[PDB]
Ligand binder design. Structure first.
Ligand SMILES: [Cl-]
Length: 178
């Protein structure tokens, strides 16, 4: 039994415990749950889980969660996740996606909604390639101070970092829209 609704293709319940977050309709997990996945607490059930860090490349380069992939542009995310979907090695097992940015307030959530839109578009309702997707509450900023040893390099570079103003500006000119 679970007290929540089913995952996106209505096949089963969400596996992870969720916390309250700004977007009322999205599912958020805490840093602690992120570490349970990374330490293999759900290995019997989760075949693969992809951590999508939606921050700009310099932020990611200054310190990210181990194994995370950096996909800041919608275009990169669609190509990496939807061109050749990442599927479980066993039907019994699940694939899960986790998105986050610096605070998981804007960037993260947006990329998450965008991937579900495209996943809906290319499938017959209600099947999905990624029916179960969460947001890391607090983003890298809250994660780093708590589990520094799960990040590489062991540092944090804010988007607003004074020495990367130029980098910030250059990168935004690469987005599909402002
Ligand atoms: Cl973009």
């Amino acid at each position: 039994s679970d007290h929540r609704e089913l995952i996106g293709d209505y096949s089963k319940a969400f596996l992870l415990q969720t916390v309250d977050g700004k977007h009322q309709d999205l599912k958020y997990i805490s840093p602690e749950t992120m570490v349970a996945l990374l330490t293999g607490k759900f290995s019997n059930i989760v075949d693969k889980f992809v951590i999508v860090d939606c921050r700009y490349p310099y932020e990611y380069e200054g310190g990210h969660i181990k194994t995370a992939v950096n996909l800041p542009l919608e275009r990169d995310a669609e190509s990496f996740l939807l061109k050749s979907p990442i599927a479980p090695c066993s039907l019994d097992k699940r694939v899960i996606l986790i998105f986050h940015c610096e605070f998981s307030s804007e960037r993260g959530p947006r990329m998450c909604r965008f991937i579900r839109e495209r996943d809906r578009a290319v499938n017959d309702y209600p099947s999905l390639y990624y029916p179960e997707m969460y947001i890391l509450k607090g983003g890298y900023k809250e994660f780093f101070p708590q589990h520094p040893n799960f990040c590489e390099p062991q540092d944090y570079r804010p988007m607003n970092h004074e020495a990367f103003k130029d980098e910030l500006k250059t990168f935004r000119l690469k987005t599909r829209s402002w």
